[PDB]
Every structure is written in structure tokens, then in C-alpha cells.
């Protein structure tokens, strides 16, 4: 549930690399972070 700045920069770089539709690919990078949590934290 917590959001470190390292995790936020990883999420921003994964969005800028992988686009917006890919979310399980981003959640593979972000440890203990589901794709719904990644999408909610981004948008």
C-alpha cells in the first residue's frame, strides 16, 4: 500500500517504456504491486 519514490520512478519509467495498456508487464517489475494498484497509482 505504501509508495516509495523509487517505486514511483520505476512506475513512471515503465509507463514511458511500455506504454499505458501494458500493466502485468509493469507489475512484473514492481515487486508486491498488482496491476490494479499500479494503474490506480499512475492515473
Amino acid at each position: 500500500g505504501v509508495w516509495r519514490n523509487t517505486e514511483d520512478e520505476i512506475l513512471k519509467a515503465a509507463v514511458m517504456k511500455y506504454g499505458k495498456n501494458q500493466w502485468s508487464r509493469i507489475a512484473s517489475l514492481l515487486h508486491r504491486k498488482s496491476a490494479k494498484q499500479c494503474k490506480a497509482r499512475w492515473y
Partner: peptide
């Protein structure tokens, strides 16, 4: 006939009858 390159994503007005009904509801 200039074609821009396709960029893939995979790779508002509200009616005031709402406001009229809401004001009538408050009254």
C-alpha cells in the same frame, strides 16, 4: 495525401434539468 505515422496505445456538458430537479428537491 500526406499520411502521418500511426502511433498505437497498445505498442463534457451536463444538463441543467439536473440542477432544477436538485433545487426542487431541496425546496
Amino acid at each position: 495525401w500526406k499520411i502521418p505515422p500511426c502511433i498505437s496505445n497498445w505498442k463534457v456538458h451536463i444538463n441543467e434539468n439536473f440542477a432544477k430537479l436538485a433545487e426542487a428537491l431541496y425546496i
